Design a protein around this ligand. Structure first.
Ligand SMILES: [N]S(=O)(=O)[C][C][C][C][C]C123[B@@]45[B@]67[B@]89[C@]1%10B81%11B698B746B814B562B%10%1143
Ligand SMILES: [N]S(=O)(=O)[C][C][C][C][C]C123[B@]45[B@]67[B@@]89[C@@]1%10B81%11B698B746B814B562B%10%1143
Ligand SMILES: [Zn+2]
Length: 258
């Protein structure tokens, strides 16, 4: 609708149009590493992206989405805390105006420079739109970004951003391999939560990887040249498109690792 990240339409305003913003399972959250309990019942995460077929990249005025063909069983997330099979539909990032902020989840109150979200829907609900209406409809794999060495697998994304500067622009983006965005380790934390953008639906199993990826300062600087505005509108840099941590309420965060 007209929500965004500014002083006048940002996270503190969202509840007026999306009252679930004050709900019982909102995301993101601070991950208190000492309180998160190791769960030996948790399985290794199975990330099967060998046949992923990226299609397009879109500036939607909030972030940019790299979209996948999800019409066949091709890029799936399984195992971990999940029951069943979840299909990759898109990924996007949240990032800051400065390297000291940008992530949505925090780790013992630490903010990372950015956070990648790989969004998957539970195939038992047939389509993404039906899945978001279910408490176990989505699985979002979250990966922190810190600034250091460049991430070679990110560069193809960085280089297409000049072609989608403004809201509503898209570009063909085929043959992109999202495996190049993963860290070495698949150790994770998990908890039940929500979309971090309106409509804030409480339909997500969050899986947040412990190990951040490193990206270069130049890579994140190019994220910060994107625009929230449309073409021919006053320039508003796309920065600080993150929701802050929300109350944990009656939830437990579980760790896959000791
Ligand atoms: N930051 S995050 O929690 O990873 C967003 C997860 C994916 C939301 C996609 C959408 B797409 B359609 B259904 C769900 B609602 B509509 B539009 B609205 B947008 B929101
Ligand atoms: N609850 S919500 O969806 O976050 C909407 C909150 C009020 C939106 C009103 C506006 B729209 B954008 B930003 C704020 B300034 B500019 B245009 B102007 B009108 B007023
Ligand atoms: Zn997100």
């Amino acid at each position: 609708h007209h929500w965004g990240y500014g002083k006048h339409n940002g996270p503190e305003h969202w509840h007026k149009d999306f009252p679930i913003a004050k709900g019982e399972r909102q995301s993101p959250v601070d991950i208190d590493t000492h309180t998160a309990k190791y769960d030996p019942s948790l399985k290794p995460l199975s990330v099967s992206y060998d046949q992923a077929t990226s299609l397009r990249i879109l500036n939607n005025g909030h972030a940019f989405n790299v979209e996948f063909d999800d019409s066949q069983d091709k890029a799936v997330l399984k195992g971990g805390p999940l029951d069943g099979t979840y299909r990759l539909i898109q990924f996007h990032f949240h990032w800051g105006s400065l390297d000291g902020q940008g992530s949505e989840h925090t780790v013992d109150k630490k903010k990372y420079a950015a956070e990648l979200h790989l969004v998957h829907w539970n195939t038992k609900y047939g389509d993404f739109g039906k899945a978001v209406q279910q408490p176990d409809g989505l699985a979002v794999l979250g990966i922190f970004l810190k600034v250091g060495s460049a991430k070679p697998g990110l560069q193809k994304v960085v280089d297409v951003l000049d072609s989608i500067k403004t809201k509503g622009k898209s570009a063909d983006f085929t043959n992109f391999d999202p495996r190049g965005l993963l860290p070495e380790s698949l150790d994770y934390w998990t908890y039940p939560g929500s979309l971090t953008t309106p409509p804030l639906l409480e339909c997500v199993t969050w899986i947040v990887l412990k190990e951040p990826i490193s990206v270069s300062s130049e890579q994140v600087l190019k994220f910060r040249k994107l625009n929230f505005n449309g073409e021919g509108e006053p320039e508003e840099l796309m920065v600080d498109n993150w929701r802050p941590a929300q109350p944990l309420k009656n939830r437990q965060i579980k760790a896959s690792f000791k």
